[PDB]
UniProtKB/Swiss-Prot annotation, chains A, B, C, D, E, F, G, H:
Cu cation binds at residue 15. Belongs to the synuclein family. It comes from Homo sapiens (Human). Soluble monomer. Homotetramer. A dynamic intracellular population of tetramers and monomers coexists normally and the tetramer plays an essential role in maintaining homeostasis. Interacts with UCHL1. Interacts with phospholipase D and histones. Interacts (via N-terminus) with synphilin-1/SNCAIP; this interaction promotes formation of SNCA inclusions in the cytoplasm. Interacts with CALM1. Interacts with STXBP1; this interaction controls SNCA self-replicating aggregation. Interacts with SNARE components VAMP2 and SNAP25; these interactions allows SNARE complex assembly and integrity. This is Alpha-synuclein. It is linked to Genetic alterations of SNCA resulting in aberrant polymerization into fibrils, are associated with several neurodegenerative diseases (synucleinopathies). SNCA fibrillar aggregates represent the major non A-beta component of Alzheimer disease amyloid plaque, and a major component of Lewy body inclusions. They are also found within Lewy body (LB)-like intraneuronal inclusions, glial inclusions and axonal spheroids in neurodegeneration with brain iron accumulation type 1. Neuronal protein that plays several roles in synaptic activity such as regulation of synaptic vesicle trafficking and subsequent neurotransmitter release. Participates as a monomer in synaptic vesicle exocytosis by enhancing vesicle priming, fusion and dilation of exocytotic fusion pores. Mechanistically, acts by increasing local Ca(2+) release from microdomains which is essential for the enhancement of ATP-induced exocytosis. The chain holds residues 36 to 95 of 140 of the full protein. Highly expressed in presynaptic terminals in the central nervous system. Expressed principally in brain. The 'non A-beta component of Alzheimer disease amyloid plaque' domain (NAC domain) is involved in fibrils formation. The middle hydrophobic region forms the core of the filaments. The C-terminus may regulate aggregation and determine the diameter of the filaments.
Length: 56, 56, 56, 56, 56, 56, 56, 56
């Protein structure tokens, strides 16, 4: 079909994924970040996005 | 189909994936970042985006 | 189909993937960063983008 | 299909992947960075982009 | 005497004086702006900081 | 006396004086801006900082 | 006396005085801008800093 | 007296005075700009810094 996106900002400070440790880090397979962030049909068909982590 | 995206900003400081350790880092397979970030059909058919990490 | 993107900014400082350690770094297979970042069909067919890392 | 991207900026400094260590670095296979960053069909067919690293 | 200032932040977007008109602008004589903004003894003695505006 | 100032940041986008008109601009005589902004004894004795503007 | 300033940053984009018109600009006599901006005794004695503007 | 300033940065772009017009510009007498900007005793004695402008 159709997807229409229209945006207008002036100030914006965007942080997609932020991680802090003070005393392992796996980040995902389809990460979309921004002032105008658009994602469409990340997986189609018999696809796969697997983000695993193992620990012993 | 159709995807139309239009954006207008003046100030914006974008950070897609940010990691901090003060006292292992694996980042993913399709990371799209910016003031205007668009992603389409990141996987199609029998594809794969696997972001694994093992630890002992 | 059709993918249209139009952006207009004035000030913006973008950081796609940023890692900091103060006391191992594997970065991913399709990383797109910028004031205007667009990605289409990062995988098609029986493709693969694997960002793995093991630790002992 | 058709892919159209148009952008207009004045001030912006982009940093695609940035790593800092203060007390091993593997960077990925398809990294696209700029004020206007566009990537299309990074993998097609039975292709592969692997950013793997081991440590002992 | 003594003035001690100590600060630690991670993210902060500071705007000292911001003005918007959509359909005259006089700004002051001692304007201090920042993440750590310190001002001491702006006027001493028989001084003066006059910020006037006249309109017909 | 003594003025001691100490600061530590990581991300901060500072804007001292910002003016916008969409449909006259006079800016002041002692404007100090930045991530660490310090001002001392901006006027001493019989001084003057005058930011005037007239309009017909 | 003593004035001590110590700063440590990583990312910061500073804009001291910024003016925008979309449909006369007088900027001031002592403007200090930067990641670390320090000003001391901008006027001493019988000094003067006058940022005036008239309009008909 | 004593003035001491110490700074350490990595990424930062400074713009002291910035003017934009899309449909007269007078800039001031003591403008100090940089990643580390320091100004001391801009006027001393019976001095003067005047940034004046008239319009008809």
């Amino acid at each position: 079909g159709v997807l229409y996106v229209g945006s207008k900002t002036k100030e914006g400070v965007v942080h997609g994924v932020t991680t802090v440790a003070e005393k392992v880090t796996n980040v995902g397979g389809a990460v979309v970040t921004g002032v105008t962030a658009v994602a469409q049909k990340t997986v189609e068909g018999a696809g796969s996005i697997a983000a695993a982590t193992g620990f012993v």
